[model samples]
Target: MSVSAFNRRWAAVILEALTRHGVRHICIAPGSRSTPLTLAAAENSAFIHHTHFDERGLGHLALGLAKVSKQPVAVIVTSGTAVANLYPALIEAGLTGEKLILLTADRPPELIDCGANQAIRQPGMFASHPTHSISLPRPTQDIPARWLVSTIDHALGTLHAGGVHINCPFAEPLYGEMDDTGLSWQQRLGDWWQDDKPWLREAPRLESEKQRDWFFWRQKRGVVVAGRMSAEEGKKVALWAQTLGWPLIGDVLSQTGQPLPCADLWLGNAKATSELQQAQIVVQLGSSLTGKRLLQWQASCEPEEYWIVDDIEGRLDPAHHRGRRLIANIADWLELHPAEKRQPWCVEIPRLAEQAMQAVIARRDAFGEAQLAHRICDYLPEQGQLFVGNSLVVRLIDALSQLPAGYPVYSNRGASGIDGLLSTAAGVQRASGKPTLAIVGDLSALYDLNALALLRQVSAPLVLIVVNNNGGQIFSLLPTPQSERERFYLMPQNVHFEHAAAMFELKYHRPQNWQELETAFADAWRTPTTTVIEMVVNDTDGAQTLQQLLAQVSHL
Candidate 1:
C-alpha cells in the first residue's frame, strides 16, 4: 500500500484510541504537516472540534475544557514554534493535574539538523511540562496498526494528570490520496474497531489507599480545608465536612459554596484567628490552595493529625509540616465511608464568619474590583458558571466571595499567570452547557486579546467582565516599590475594550456604576450572544476598598 494510505490508517487508529479514552474535545491549529491528524480529528464524530489560530491559546482552551469537563482533551498542532507555544498551558496542566493529549505533528526524521523550515528537535520538546512524552516514527507498513493504537493506549495510561505529548512525524506528501478505497481498518484494528471501550482499560478509581479512622477522627476538633478539586469531589467533601460538623476553609478554585467566604480576611482578625486554632486535626482536600494566611495558620498550628487527601502524588504542603498524604480518588473514598453529623468543632469560627458576611454585604455598595469579587457571585444567575482570572481578581475572590453550591467555577490558577484567561474561560463555557461569567483584569484581557474571537463564537452565553482598572491594579495591593511603581510595576494602559468588542462583533456594555454593572451583567446572562462588560475603576480603588473591608470586620 502507498505511504498516504499507511499515514491515514495510523491517524485513524490514534483518534479511535483517544475517543475510547474519553477525549471529547480536540483543539486544533491550522498547519500543513498536521493535516493527517486534523482530518482524522474532524472526521471523528466523538470529538467536538475546537480550532484556534494561536496554539498557545488553543493549549489553554484545551486546559479549560479538561478542567471543567473532568476529561482528557486533545490538542493538534504542527511542528516548530507552534509546539513551543503550548509550554504555558502544559506547565499549567503539570501543576493543576489536567489531562491534555498534545498530538503535535512534527517533521519526519532526516528533516531536522539539515536546517529544515518549521522543524526543531521535536522529541521531548516540552520536557517535564508534559507528564508523559512519546514520539512516533513516520507511518509505515512495517509497524503494525495495532501497535500504533496500543502506543496511544500506553500514553493514555500515563496521563492520569497533566499532558501526554505524542509527537507525530510525517514525511513529504503530507496530504496524499483522501480515498477510503485503499484505507484498511481490518489490519489496523481488530476488536478495537468494533469495541466502544479502550483496549487495555484499567480500574481508574480502585486504589490501595488505607481507609483510616475518618469516623473516629470526626470526634475531634477538626478543620476541613478545600483546595483545587472537581465539583463532584468538592460537593462530596463539603457535605462530609458539614456532616462531621467541622468548619470548612476553601480556596478560590474550590468553586463549591464556601461556608466561610471570609476565610482569608478573617484570618487577620485576632478573635477569628484564635477561634480557628481550636481545631485538633486538619483534613485538606486537593491542592493548589490560594490563601496565604490559611497556609500560615496550618503550618503554625500543627494539629494532632494533618491529613491531606488528594489524587495527585507529591508533597502538597509548602509549609513543610509533617502530614499524612493519601493519594486516592476523593469522591469514591467519601462514598464508601459515610457518617452522620457529629458535634460541631470550632463553632465560633462560623459565627465570626457570619458576622463578617453582614459587614461584607453592607460594604458591597460599589462596583470596584473588591466589590466585584464580593458581588459578582451574588449577581450570577443560578445557571451561570464563573471563570475568575489570575492575579488580584483570583486572590480577591478567595478572600471575599462566597460561591453558590450548584454553580461551577474555573480559573487557570495552576501557573496563576495573567495570560490565556479569555481562551480558558471560553473553553469552560463550551464544555459546560451554561452561561459563563468570566471576570478578568484589563491587562489580562489585553494579554489574551486574540481569544476574543474564540469567545465570540461560544456555544453558551458568555458575560466577559473585563475589570479595566487601567493596568496591573494588583500591584497596588502588593507592597512593591512606591517610588517606581507607576511605570515599572503598574505599567498602566489607556486602551478601552469598546474597540475590541467592535472588532470581534461581541455585544459591548460599558457600565459606569454599581447599578449599571448589576443590570449589564444580569442581562448579559440571558443574552444569547457573548457580551463584554467593561468595568472601569480607579487604579487604587481595589486596594483601598479591600483595606476598608478588612478594617470594618477586623474588629469583629
Candidate 2:
C-alpha cells in the first residue's frame, strides 16, 4: 500500500472503531501532521467534525461536549505544544470522567528527537492523566492492519474512565487516495469492511489474569464493591476488601462481611460522598447492582482506574465511566492478584451508614411508611427468600433497610416496574420452593393484582406485603409542587387488596402497627398458605418522613 494511503487507512480504521463506541464528535486543529485524521474525520459521514484555530479552546470545547453529551469526543491536533495545550482539559476530564479521545498526530520516531521543528516526546506528554496512552508506530502495511484496529479497541477499554491519548506518527505524505480497489494490505481485516461492526468485538472477560498489572493499583487508594456473586466468590472478595481496607460496599446481592450498609441512604451524608470520591482504583467483584447514588458518586469522582472482575464477558458498566472489564472467575483473580494490607480511605463512611440506620431505628416509633420501611427489614423467615418491588419498595429498602446479607434478595429493579411485581415474586417462590416474602407498594400490587392466583397455588410460605399509601407517593419526593398534588401527582386510590386476595382465595391481614406487622409476617411464614399484608397510610407521609430522616442524618 502507498504510504499516504496506509496513513489514511489506519486513521479511518481508528475513527471507525471509535465511532462504534459512542464517539460522534471530532475536534480538529489545523496541522499537516494531523492531515490524515483531519481528512479521515471529514470524509467519515458518521462523524460530526468540529474545528477551532486554537488547540487549547478546542480541547476545552471537546471537554464540555463530552461532559454534556455523555459520549466520548475525539480531538485531532499536531504534535508538540499542540498536545501540551490539551493538558488542562485532560486533567479535568481525568477527574470528572469526561471521555476525551485525543488523537495527536506526531512526527515519526526518526523525526522526533533530532531537533525537528515543533517536535517533542508526545507519548508521555501528559503523564499521570489519561488512564491509558497508545503511541502508534509509523502507520504501515507490514505491521498487520488487524493489530492497529485491535490496539484502538484496547485503548477504548480505558475510555469508560476518562481521556485516552492515541499518538500516531504520519510520515511525509499525509494525504492520499483512499481507493478501495487494489488495497490488498488491509485484507487481514477480512469481511470487516463490508460489516457495520468494528474490526474487533470484545466481551467482558477475565482471560488476562497473567497480563494484569496489580503492582501499581495496590500501591494507590483502592476501593472494593462485592456485587452479586456466589458464596465463595463473595467471601474471597470480602477478604480482598479486608486486605485493602478500602470502602467495602456490599450490593444488595453481595454477601461480603462488614459491608457499608444502606449506602444509598448513608451517601446522603455529604462527608461520605466526599470520602468515596477519593478513590484512585475501584475493583468490583461481580455485577450485583443497587443504588443510583453510588453510581453518581463514581461518575463524579471518576476514579483513575476501575476494574470489574466477573466470570462473564460483555460491557457491565452502565455509567460508561472509564474502566476496563476483566473476564475471569472472580475468586481466581482474587487469588492470583497479590494484595497489600493498606489503610482504609472511608472508615467514617460505614459509621455514617450506621448513623443513617440509627436515624431509621429512632424514627420508627409510629407505624407510618417510614417506620414500616425501617422495621420490615428483619421480618423475613430464616433461610427464606425476599422479593422487592421496583417502584417505591426498592428505594425504601435501599434507603432504610439492611437485611441480613446473603438472603438471596430478588427484584424487578432491572426494568423498575410495578407493572408485574406480584407475578415475578410468585414465579420466584414457585421456582425455588422456599418461604418467600415479597414487598410492593399499593399502586404496584394493584397493577398486577391478577398475579395473586399464582401465589394461591404455592405450597410454601408466601407473604406479599403492600404498604398501602393509596397512591404512587414515590413521586412526591421529586421537585414538583405540593399544590393540587392529590389528583394528578399522587394518583391516590381508595381500594385495598383484601378484595383481590378474597377473589384469589388467599389469606389477608391489615397490620395496624409495627408489632402487628411482625406478627403478621411470622404467621405467614409459619403457614404454607399465601397471605397478603396491607399497611395503609396517608399518601403524604412518605415524602415528609424521608426528608425528615435524611435531614437528621445529613450532618453525620
Return the TM-score for candidate 2, rounded to 2 decimals: 0.59
After TM-score superposition, what is the CA distance of residue 397 in candidate 1 from its true location, in Å?
2.1
Candidate 2: what lDDT? Answer: 0.73
Badly placed stretches (over 4 Å) of model 2 are 1-211, 228-236, 310-314, 328-333, 336-340, 483-485
Best-matching candidate per lDDT: 1
After superposing all C-alphas onto the true structure, candidate 2 shows an RMSD in angstroms of 17.1
The C-alpha lDDT values of all candidates are: 0.81, 0.73
For candidate 1, the clash count comes to 0
**CA lDDT for candidate 1:** 0.81
In model 1, where do residues sit more than 4 Å from their true spots?
Answer: 178-188, 202-208
Per residue, candidate 1 scores C-alpha lDDT tens digits across 212-303 of 67668667888888888777677777788888887888787775588787777787678876876777888888788887667777777768
TM-score of each: 0.94, 0.59
**Clashes per candidate (backbone, < 3 Å):** 0, 13
For all predictions, the C-alpha RMSD in Å is: 2.1, 17.1
